[PDB]
Amino acid sequence: PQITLWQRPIVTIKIGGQLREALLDTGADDTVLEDIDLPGRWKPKLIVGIGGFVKVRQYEQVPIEIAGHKVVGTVLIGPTPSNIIGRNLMTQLGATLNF
Amino acid sequence: PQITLWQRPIVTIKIGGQLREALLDTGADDTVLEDIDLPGRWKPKLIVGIGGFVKVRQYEQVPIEIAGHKVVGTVLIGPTPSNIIGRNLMTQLGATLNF
Numbered sequence A, B: 001p002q003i004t005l006w007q008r009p010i011v012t013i014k015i016g017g018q019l020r021e022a023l024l025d026t027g028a029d030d031t032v033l034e035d036i037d038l039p040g041r042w043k044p045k046l047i048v049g050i051g052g053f054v055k056v057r058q059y060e061q062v063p064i065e066i067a068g069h070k071v072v073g074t075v076l077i078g079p080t081p082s083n084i085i086g087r088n089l090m091t092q093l094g095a096t097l098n099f
């Protein structure tokens, strides 16, 4: 799609049967979801946001569907006021910003 | 321009006659800079991101030059890991996300 930015750019995502919504954030290096579970071991990571640091679980090479497009990449699970899709997965959609 | 997202989308902008770099940030409602003093009156606000909330000065009516356009808009000054250009200004460019 072509998405204008008058409202927040929210798309549907799906991870192993969990259907959720998330924000396309070109200021995010990484993808951070709160309302999802993923199986097995993770790597604990601290990440930086505008308001401070947060502890997340890092899961690698996760299959995920974003606005109906299947991609694979790292997903971080932890507290956030909004689910966020970062550049790590937006590059897999071939996303561009046009300005 | 049309840019991919393999790197951070960083651009130079002129804010109140001063040049700074900043990240084009579709997941930001607002434009937030930390390395700059602006003149005149402001109002105290708070922004929220991943880590929590930060106190900012809200400066309305700031002249800005960005991507060849001359615009007037609001800038929030306060502490941020990176300067960020949000949707308040991207919309004035007619910016879009495409994939």
Ligand SMILES: CCCC[C@H](NC(=O)[C@H](C)NC(=O)[C@H](CCC(=O)O)NC(=O)[C@H](Cc1ccccc1)NC[C@H](CC(C)C)NC(=O)[C@@H](NC(=O)[C@@H](N)CCCNC(N)=[NH2+])C(C)C)C(N)=O
Residues within 6 Å of the ligand: A023, A025, A027, A028, A029, A030, A031, A032, A047, A048, A049, A050, A081, A082, A084, A086, B023, B025, B027, B028, B029, B030, B031, B032, B045, B046, B047, B048, B049, B050, B058, B076, B081, B082, B084, B086
């Ligand atoms: C004036 C007041 C009114 C509006 C005010 N609105 C806000 O507070 C809105 C919701 N907040 C936002 O839109 C803020 C930005 C600030 C702003 O726009 O004001 N956005 C954000 O903070 C969004 C995520 C988010 C989105 C929506 C809601 C909540 C959080 N992330 C932007 C942020 C920018 C980065 C440079 C630190 N990115 C990150 O936090 C990501 N972090 C990363 O990518 C890390 N690798 C670190 C990068 C550091 N870079 C560097 N050092 N150069 C993370 C998501 C993995 C309100 N109170 O409602």
Ligand SMILES: [Cl-]
Residues within 6 Å of the ligand: A006, A007, A008
């Ligand atoms: Cl919105």
Ligand SMILES: [Cl-]
Residues within 6 Å of the ligand: A010, A011, A012, A066, A067, A068
């Ligand atoms: Cl969608």
Ligand SMILES: [Cl-]
Residues within 6 Å of the ligand: A039, A040, A041
């Ligand atoms: Cl495991």
Ligand SMILES: [Cl-]
Residues within 6 Å of the ligand: A046, A047, A048
């Ligand atoms: Cl980080």
Ligand SMILES: [Cl-]
Residues within 6 Å of the ligand: B053, B054, B055
């Ligand atoms: Cl603060």
Ligand SMILES: [Cl-]
Residues within 6 Å of the ligand: B072, B073, B074, B088, B089
């Ligand atoms: Cl504005």
Ligand code: NA
Residues within 6 Å of the ligand: B040, B060, B061, B062, B063
């Ligand atoms: Na002014």
